[PDB]
Amino acid sequence: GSSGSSGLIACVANDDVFSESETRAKFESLFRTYDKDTTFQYFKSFKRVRINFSNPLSAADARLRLHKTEFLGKEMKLYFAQTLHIGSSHLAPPNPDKSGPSSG
């Protein structure tokens, strides 16, 4: 699966978590602790946090180890990011180009 989806949309109610103060870290550590290549994307106003992982494994544990779990006293939620971007078969791409794929 060259291009696989391994993200998670964590919904936090603590408006503070959306600050550089520190409250944020705590939230990150929760996931970061698992994977180090995990990326975090905070969306102000949308009260959403997209956490991308390096493998479809951690993403799972990140849910059980989190979610409803009372995060600092406030219950947080987590949804499985549906795919990456719009799919569906469309106008086939133009002729390919020279390339040398490696093993996997």
UniProtKB/Swiss-Prot annotation:
Top-level taxon of origin: Eukaryota
Post-translational modification, as annotated: Phosphorylation increases its ability to inhibit calcineurin and decreases protein half-life.
Expression (tissue specificity): Highly expressed in heart and skeletal muscle. Also expressed in all other tissues.
Signal peptide (UniProt feature, chain positions): none
Assembly, per entry: Interacts with RAF1 and PPP3R1. Interacts with PPP3CA.
Record function comment: Inhibits calcineurin-dependent transcriptional responses by binding to the catalytic domain of calcineurin A. Could play a role during central nervous system development.
Family statement: Belongs to the RCAN family.
Designated name of the protein: Calcipressin-1
Gene responsible for this protein: Rcan1
Residues of the full protein shown: 66 to 156 of 251
